[PDB]
C-alpha cells in the first residue's frame, strides 16, 4: 500500500537533528546485539573500479533486522565520493535508508541517510564514553573537520556537560579555522582550540575522536595521556601498536572486524591479538555483562566498524516519531 | 538534490507493463556483462529467522554498477514472504530499487520494484529462447501461476507470435484454472490447456519455463523432449540428472551459480560438472562469442539466478522514459 518519505528536514523536524533519540535507538540496537536478537549480512562495497579507485569511492550495502517488541527490518544504501567536498561543493557521503515491516517484508519508508548516519556514528561514541571515558572529562579531542566530526562535537556537547575545552585539528588547515570559529559562536562558555599538528590536539584530549579520510595511522601509543578514551571512528587513524598497548579494546561487533582486510585482523593473522585480547563488544558494555573503565589510568581504544542495526533502529524511531507528528510525504507503492 | 520516485502504476505509465523495454535494456546489460564492464558483489539474504523459516522468507540487497555511454549504480532490495498470497492476499515479493549518478554516487530514482523485476526475469526467457529455442517453436509451457509465471507468459506471446498452444500446470488446481481462463479471454486465438499433472505440461512444451516456490526438484529429464529449451526461472524444479544430460547447459553467471549451496556448486563439489562443462554464460549468447543452438534435437537448460545488472538497467532505462514523459513524484533529498 504505503510508504513514508522523509528527507533530511523532515528527519530534522522529527527530532532526527537531537543526539538524544539515537542514544536512546542504540542503546535498544546495542541490548539486542548483546542478546544476539538481530541478523546482520556482512555489508558489501559496490566500488565502480574496486583498485583503480580511492577508498572513499564505494557504496555499501546494509542490511539488517532487529527482534524483540518492535521488530524492524531495513537497509542503509550509503555512497561516497572522496572529492565531492573538494570538487563538487558536495557532501561526501550520501543515501537512503529503506525500513521493512518484517511480518510482510513490504517496504514501510523511504529516509534520507547521511543526517542518520552521522548521528548515530556520534551516539556511539556517546555511549562508548559513557561507560569507557574517565567521569567528568574536561577536555575532548576532535580530528578531521567534515561532517562526522561536526556531528560528534555536537552530541558530545550536548551529551557532556561537563567538557570545558575541545582541540580541534584538521590536516587541511582552513577547514579547521572555519569549524572552531563557527564553534566559539555556537558555544561561548566552551574554549575551541585549533592546533597546528595531530600530536598537540591528541595529546590534550581526555577523549579522543577521530573524523579522518586516511588510510594511513598517524596516531602513535605514546601521544595519549594515560586515562585517555579514543573512539577510533573513522578506523584508519590509529597505528597497530595502539591496538596492543593499549589496556582495553572494544569494538561494536567482532566478527564484523577480524574481516581478512582489517587491522584486527592482521594482528590477529599475525600473533598480536586474539577475540580473547579483545575487551568486549560495546553492547556488553551497554548490558552490564563486561565492566567499562576501571580505573582512571587504562588507555580505551573503541574500534567501531558501523553496523547496520544502528542505522535501522534510528531511522524506525524517527520513522515513529514523524508519524506521530503527521511528518513527511506518504507515497504509494504500487 | 532531487530524486524521481516512480510507483508501479508511473512504471507502467512509462513503458514498464511492454517486454520490449526490457528486452532493450538486458540486451544491452548483458552486452556489457560479456565485456566485464560491470561490477556485481554476492548478493546478501536477510533472514529474520535463517534456518527457522521458509526458504521464500528473506530480503535481498542486489547491488550493481554498470559501465558504459551512460554508466549506472544501484539497488535492488527486493523482499519475500512465502505465505503473502495465501495469508494476506499480497504479492509475495515486495521493494524498491534505487538509482545513483556514478559521478557522486547520490541516489536519484527510488522506484517500486516488482514489477521491473518479474519484467527483467521475463525478459531473460525471452532473449536466451532467441538463441536456445528450436526457431517457430508452438508449444509453450508455464509451471506455475503466480506472478512470475503471468509475467513470463505476457512477454513470451508478446514476443514470439509463432507461438499457438500454451499448457499450464500448477499444484494449486484453482490457480492454474482461473489463470488459464483469464489468459484464455486476453488471447483467444491460442490455446491454453490446464494440465493435470507436471508431466503432462512439461512433455508437451517446446519451451519449457520453471516458476514455482519448490525446493524439491520434480521435472525429470525423460520428460524433456528432443529439441526442448528449459528456462528454469524458479531454479529447484529441475533434477540434477538434467543438469548432466542436457546437450546444453546455460547461465546468466558461472560465479554467481558456482556458490556453495547451489545445484551446479554440487554438481561441481561432486566430479559430475565443470566450469569446462558449462556451455555459455548467456551474454555471450548475445554477443556471438559462444553459439547457440545448433540443432533440433539438443535439450538445452538455461539455469539464471537472477543479477543485479538486470534490475539496474532495467530500472535506468524506464526513469530516462518517465523523465522523458514528465512521469512520477519528484523528492527532495535534504
Ligand atoms: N561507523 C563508522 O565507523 C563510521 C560511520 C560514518 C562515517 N565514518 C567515517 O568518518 C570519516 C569522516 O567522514 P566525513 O563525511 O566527515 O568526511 P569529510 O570529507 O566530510 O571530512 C574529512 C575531514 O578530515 C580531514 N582529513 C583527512 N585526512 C586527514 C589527516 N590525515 N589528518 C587530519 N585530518 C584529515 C579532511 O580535510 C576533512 O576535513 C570517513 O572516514 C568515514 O568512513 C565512520
Ligand atoms: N532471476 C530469477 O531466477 C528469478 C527472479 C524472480 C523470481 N524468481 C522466482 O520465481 C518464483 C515464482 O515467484 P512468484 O512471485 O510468482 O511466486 P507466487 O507465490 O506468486 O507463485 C508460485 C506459484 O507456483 C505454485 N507452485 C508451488 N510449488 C509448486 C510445484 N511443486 N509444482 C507446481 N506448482 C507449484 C504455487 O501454487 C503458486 O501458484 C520464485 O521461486 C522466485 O524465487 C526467480
Not at 85 to 96: F, H, I, L, T
Not at 128 to 141: I, P, V
Not at 207 to 219: A, G, H, L, R, S
Request: proline share 3%; net charge negative.
Amino acid at each position: 500500500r504505503e510508504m513514508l518519505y522523509l528527507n533530511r528536514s523532515d528527519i530534522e523536524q522529527a527530532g532526527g537533528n537531537h543526539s538524544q533519540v539515537y542514544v536512546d535507538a542504540l542503546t535498544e540496537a546495542l541490548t539486542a546485539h548483546a542478546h544476539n536478537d538481530f541478523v546482520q549480512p556482512l555489508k558489501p562495497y559496490l566500488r565502480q573500479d574496486p583498485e583503480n579507485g580511492h577508498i572513499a569511492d564505494r557504496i555499501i550495502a546494509m542490511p539488517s533486522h532487529i527482534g524483540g517488541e518492535h521488530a524492524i527490518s531495513g537497509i542503509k544504501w550509503i555512497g561516497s565520493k572522496h572529492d565531492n567536498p573538494s570538487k563538487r561543493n558536495m557532501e561526501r557521503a550520501s543515501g537512503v535508508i529503506i525500513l521493512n515491516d518484517p511480518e510482510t517484508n513490504y517496504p514501510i519508508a523511504v529516509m534520507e541517510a547521511s543526517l542518520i548516519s552521522s548521528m548515530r556514528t556520534a551516539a556511539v561514541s556517546v555511549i562508548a564514553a559513557k561507560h569507557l571515558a574517565k567521569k567528568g572529562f574536561k577536555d575532548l579531542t576532535i580530528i578531521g573537520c567534515g561532517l562526522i566530526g561536526d556531528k560528534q562535537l555536537q552530541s558530545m556537547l550536548e551529551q557532556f556537560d561537563h567538557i570545558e575545552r575541545v582541540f580541534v585539528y584538521d590536516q587541511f588547515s582552513e577547514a579547521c579555522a572555519r569549524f572552531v570559529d563557527r564553534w566559539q559562536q555556537q558555544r561561548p562558555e566552551i574554549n575551541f582550540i585549533a592546533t597546528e599538528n595531530a600530536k598537540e590536539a591528541v595529546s590534550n584530549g581526555e577523549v579522543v575522536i577521530t573524523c579522518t579520510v586516511t588510510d594511513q595511522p598517524y596516531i602513535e601509543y605514546d601521544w595519549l595521556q594515560k586515562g585517555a578514551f579514543i573512539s577510533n571512528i573513522s578506523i584508519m587513524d590509529v597505528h597497530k601498536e595502539v591496538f596492543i598497548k593499549a589496556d582495553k579494546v572494544v569494538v561494536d561487533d567482532w566478527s564484523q572486524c577480524n574481516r581478512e582486510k582489517k587491522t584486527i585482523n592482521q594482528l590477529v593473522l599475525e600473533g598480536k591479538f586474539s577475540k580473547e585480547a579483545l575487551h568486549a563488544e560495546l553492547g556488553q558494555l551497554v548490558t552490564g555483562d563486561i565492566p567499562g573503565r576501571e580505573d582512571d589510568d587504562e588507555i580505551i581504544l573503541l574500534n567501531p566498524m558501523g553496523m547496520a542495526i544502528e542505522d535501522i533502529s534510528s531511522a524506525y524511531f524517527i520513522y515513529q516519531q514523524a508519524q506521530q507528528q503527521n511528518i513527511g510525504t506518504t507515497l504509494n507503492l504500487y
